[PDB]
Ligand binder design. Structure first.
Ligand SMILES: [Mg+2]
Ligand SMILES: [Mg+2]
Ligand SMILES: [Mg+2]
Ligand SMILES: [Mg+2]
Ligand SMILES: [Mg+2]
Ligand SMILES: [Mg+2]
Ligand SMILES: [Mg+2]
Ligand SMILES: [Mg+2]
Ligand SMILES: [Mg+2]
Ligand SMILES: [Mg+2]
Ligand SMILES: [Mg+2]
Ligand SMILES: [Mg+2]
Lengths: 124, 128, 225, 109, 216, 51
RNA sequence: GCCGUCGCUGGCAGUCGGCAGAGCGAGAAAGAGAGUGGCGCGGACGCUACGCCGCGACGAGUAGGAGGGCCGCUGCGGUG
RNA sequence: GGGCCCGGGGGGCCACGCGUCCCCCGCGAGCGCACGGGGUCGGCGGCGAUGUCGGCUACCCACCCGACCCGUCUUGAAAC
């Protein structure tokens, strides 16, 4: 299930990394990038991920569907938002809040999308 | 315009000097690393007045300002560009640090990616 | 609908508020009755002393039921029986004070530890400084400061001791549940005496501070606290 | 156009017979040798003025070689007009038996 | 609807009323005062009418926010503090300014300002001291007083009048105010014998003179 | 909770004891009335010394 | 004030959000319980539950015992 | 003196309503002030790009106090 494989992943996963009295996870779907149960995305049926796009502009949002859990190719669906700063975060908030799709991670996804926008903004 | 931390508390330290080993001044074979003396008639181990201090648990720093740089950041050793997407989110609290064995052509990419991600590097001019 | 629900919540909040106001009125009137009792007890001893001198006799006052004991000497080099009596009187560090009621057992328990303690018969204002300034209760076996009367009333409400004035009245006018009030009171962690001491080792009679000092303990309670 | 500081000689530190507590300094202000007379200087600001090799900045003027360690007169000491002071940086023992300046402008008059 | 009335009972002790609560009830006469029982703006756009939003959601969020702090109860700003006074510092006295660049000068005190600083002004011919603010602690107060109560101080000058703007040229308003205050001070201090020389001369400590010993 | 001293602090003493409000409201009025009676007795003594 | 130990086997799965109503510090064995007759889509952190947080007391040490080491050296199976 | 200082013919009060019977002689609302569940200022002043600011720790030196060379067997070691 969820906790059953969390008790396996929690110490001996390949994405896990430990140095400088810190612990992280280098997963592509992990948001806030630290080792935690609520933030781990490969375990849960409902998974939100916020990534930069293949191009320089735009932010892609990764949504794990509930049907193909054991099918890794058709598990995740990617959508690109190449929009302005306010309505991009509003679109992600309307994705996570109003669809009843894992509401515990909406604010972390908004923070990560703001970080990717600050990254893709041109440097001073 | 350096990268400021989120909160900057007063980093108080109870002791800044090194706990040097007993009789490290006399002999060259004795290193400065602390080893607890466990003799029967030694002066340091039973806490005589005016002797070398011992590393007790009372000298521990506060948990808010432990492992903290004087800038206000916490160190994290980074080998390549892929380990900066780990620290793009935890930006205002923790900082990055490039390893010694990393070549300059990859240090340039690490510094450029950290400048994009607004992450402070403790050694931004490591090779040049 | 949430029509009757919010109104009933406001009614329950108003009920708790008026219940709290009634308990405050009870605490106020208990403190006023206690002030009247202290006035009566202070004047009746002077009255008994005046009528005996008017008749030509002598008034022997009643022996005071309550004493305050301060462990004035340290822990090093202590007899085991003496150390047992000190830990049964809850005197563990130096300069700790406890209220002890008097009987034939208590007099000999203080007599067996006379050279290590200073015990006397305290005043009402001395009890007031000891309870208000150093008020520490043992709630869930923890030394918690008595900043509110609810902390006293949660532990000793079944013994009709619901406020600081109830506790002071019990300790000064020792009654039934002095054992529960004193066991609620943590041993008073008092400071060093300001100015100095006469002598720690010898008895109060032979030029020191140890032993019994009946009326003179009020000079030393205010000196330490 | 004159002296605006009282003469005080730094005797030593707060010390026992075989221990010293160098964070508290013992100060001997000239002219006052009584506990009833040392109540005036309680709370005044005091400083050991010394000059060094390298130049340091000076507020309200050109940089000079003089340096100070500011402080605060805490409470009296003894019975013969000695007094205490707590400084921010501890005094060197080079200044044993030398002049420091106790001031008047932390006034209570 | 009702006019505001002041406090009935006087300040007997700080935090303690002079009357008890039932006498206060009888004074309030509450026996006969008993009782029983935005963000959206529509704007036409030349389409239809658009509904704009005020205080909309932010476009940028930082990486981490700090939590809110606890509510302290007795921590006032500097404008709302109480402003203390000494018994020696009265309007009319002659002060000794020490810590400023005007060291040891005996300068006449005028009045207490709003922020808490001392408005101190000597004659420009005598002290060479302007309309200057001094701190209360940083001043020796000498008991030498003049009858200053019959003057007309300007009301336009205040703490904001003497606050530093940002070379500093002397404006004409400072000169007019200095002349208007000097014309009120100067005959009252020249009526006192040998006072202008005391104002011109500087204070200085010397050998065998100690402030705990002398009185003033 | 920071233990504020009821002997020093007024409102902590009021929270632990409401009757301390009336105990401290009294012996201000009483002491001022006794001081005014002392001033009246001193004035009567000075009037007796004058007359 | 700070560090560690012990105890309360204390608290936290309640992040229950137009599928909503934001609490269980309060002296008093037990329910902010169901019924039936007379415009604006909005709300910081969290929780490696081997983790996080709050209360109190405690802190010497030879021989000796136990626990924690994201202290250190060498080699192997995985992993970066 | 104690009994709400039993009862009858100038000062303080944690006492505020209406109707019925017997005996004795549970929601009223609004605005501030603050000795109230641990500090704030909605207060400021100076010095600065060719000589100055900060660097607790680490390089050297000066001063005060402390201060006998480690392991060992030993009741006891700085031990002649
Ligand atoms: Mg030995
Ligand atoms: Mg002994
Ligand atoms: Mg003393
Ligand atoms: Mg000089
Ligand atoms: Mg201890
Ligand atoms: Mg130990
Ligand atoms: Mg010496
Ligand atoms: Mg041997
Ligand atoms: Mg042998
Ligand atoms: Mg032998
Ligand atoms: Mg030896
Ligand atoms: Mg020998």
């Amino acid at each position: 299930s969820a906790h059953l494989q969390w008790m396996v992943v929690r110490n001996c996963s390949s994405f896990l990394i430990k140095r400088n009295k810190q612990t992280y996870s280098t997963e592509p779907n992990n948001l806030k990038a630290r080792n935690s149960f609520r933030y781990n995305g490969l375990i849960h049926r409902k998974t939100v991920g916020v990534e930069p796009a293949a191009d320089g502009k735009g932010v892609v949002v990764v949504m794990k569907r509930r049907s193909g859990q054991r099918k890794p190719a058709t598990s995740y669906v990617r959508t690109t938002i190449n929009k302005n700063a306010r309505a991009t975060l509003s679109s992600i908030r309307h994705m996570i809040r109003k669809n009843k799709y894992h509401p515990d991670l909406r604010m972390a996804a908004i923070r990560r999308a703001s970080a990717i926008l600050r990254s893709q903004k041109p440097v001073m | 315009a350096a990268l400021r931390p989120l909160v900057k508390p007063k980093i108080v330290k109870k002791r800044t000097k090194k706990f040097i080993r007993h009789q490290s001044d006399r002999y060259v074979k004795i290193k400065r690393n602390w080893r607890k003396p466990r003799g029967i008639d030694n002066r340091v181990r039973r806490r005589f007045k005016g002797q070398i201090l011992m590393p007790n648990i009372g000298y521990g720093s506060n948990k808010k300002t432990k492992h903290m740089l004087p800038s206000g950041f916490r160190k994290f050793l980074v080998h390549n560009v892929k380990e900066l997407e780990v620290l793009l989110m935890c930006n205002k609290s923790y900082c990055a640090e490039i390893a010694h064995n990393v070549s300059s052509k990859n240090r340039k990419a690490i510094v450029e990616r950290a400048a994009q991600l607004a992450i402070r590097v403790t050694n931004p001019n490591a090779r040049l | 609908n949430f029509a009757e629900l919010k109104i009933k919540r406001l009614r329950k909040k108003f009920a708790q508020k008026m219940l709290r106001k009634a308990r405050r009125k009870l605490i106020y009137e208990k403190a006023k009755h206690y002030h009247k009792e202290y006035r009566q007890m202070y004047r009746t001893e002077i009255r008994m002393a005046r009528m005996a001198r008017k008749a030509g006799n002598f008034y022997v006052p009643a022996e005071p039921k309550l004493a305050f004991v301060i462990r004035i000497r340290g822990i090093n080099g202590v007899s085991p029986k003496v150390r047992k009596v000190l830990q049964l009187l809850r005197l563990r560090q130096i300069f700790n004070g406890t209220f002890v009621k008097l009987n034939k057992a208590s007099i000999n328990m203080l007599r067996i530890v006379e050279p290590y303690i200073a015990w006397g018969y305290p005043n009402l204002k001395s009890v007031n400084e000891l309870i208000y300034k150093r008020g520490y209760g043992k709630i869930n076996k923890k030394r918690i400061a008595l900043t509110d009367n609810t902390l006293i009333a949660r532990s000793l409400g079944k013994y009709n001791i619901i406020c600081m004035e109830d506790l002071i009245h019990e300790i000064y006018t020792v009654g039934k549940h002095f054992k529960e009030a004193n066991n609620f009171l943590w041993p008073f962690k008092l400071s060093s005496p300001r100015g100095g001491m006469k002598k720690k080792t010898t008895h109060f009679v032979e030029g020191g501070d140890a032993g019994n000092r009946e009326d003179q303990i009020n000079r030393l309670i205010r000196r330490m606290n | 156009s004159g002296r605006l500081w009282c003469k005080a000689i730094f005797a030593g530190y707060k010390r026992g017979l075989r221990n010293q507590r160098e964070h508290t300094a013992l100060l001997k202000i000239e002219g006052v040798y009584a506990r009833d007379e040392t109540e005036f200087y309680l709370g005044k600001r005091c400083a050991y003025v010394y000059k060094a090799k390298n130049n340091t900045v000076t507020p309200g003027g050109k940089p000079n070689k003089t340096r100070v360690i500011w402080g605060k007169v805490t409470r009296a000491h003894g019975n013969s007009g000695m007094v205490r002071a707590k400084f921010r940086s501890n005094l060197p023992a080079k200044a044993i038996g030398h002049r420091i300046r106790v001031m008047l402008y932390p006034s209570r008059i | 609807k009702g006019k505001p009335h002041c406090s009935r009972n006087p300040v007997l002790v700080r935090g303690i009323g002079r009357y008890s609560r039932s006498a206060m009830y009888s004074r309030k006469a509450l026996y006969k005062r008993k009782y029983a029982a935005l963000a959206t703006v529509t704007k036409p756009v030349g389409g239809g009418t658009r509904v704009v939003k005020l205080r909309k959601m932010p476009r940028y969020y930082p990486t981490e926010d700090v939590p809110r702090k606890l509510l302290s109860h007795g921590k006032k700003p500097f404008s709302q503090h109480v402003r203390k006074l000494r018994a020696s510092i009265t309007p009319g006295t002659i002060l000794i300014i020490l810590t400023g660049r005007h060291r040891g000068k005996r300068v006449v005190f005028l009045k207490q300002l709003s922020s808490g600083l001392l408005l101190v002004t000597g004659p420009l011919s005598l002290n060479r001291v302007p309309l200057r603010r001094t701190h209360q602690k940083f001043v020796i107060a000498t008991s030498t007083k003049i009858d200053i109560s019959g003057v007309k101080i300007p009301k336009h000058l205040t703490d904001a009048y003497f606050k530093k703007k940002k070379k500093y040229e002397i404006t004409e308003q400072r000169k007019v105010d200095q002349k208007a205050v000097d014309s009120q001070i100067l005959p009252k201090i020249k009526a006192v014998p040998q006072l202008q020389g005391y104002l011109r001369s500087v204070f200085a400590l010397t050998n065998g003179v100690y402030p705990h010993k002398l009185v003033f | 909770v920071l233990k504020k001293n009821p002997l020093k602090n007024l409102r902590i003493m009021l929270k632990l004891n409401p009757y301390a409000k009336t105990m401290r409201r009294n012996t201000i009025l009483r002491q001022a009335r006794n001081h005014k009676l002392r001033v009246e007795r001193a004035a009567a003594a000075l009037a007796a010394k004058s007359d």
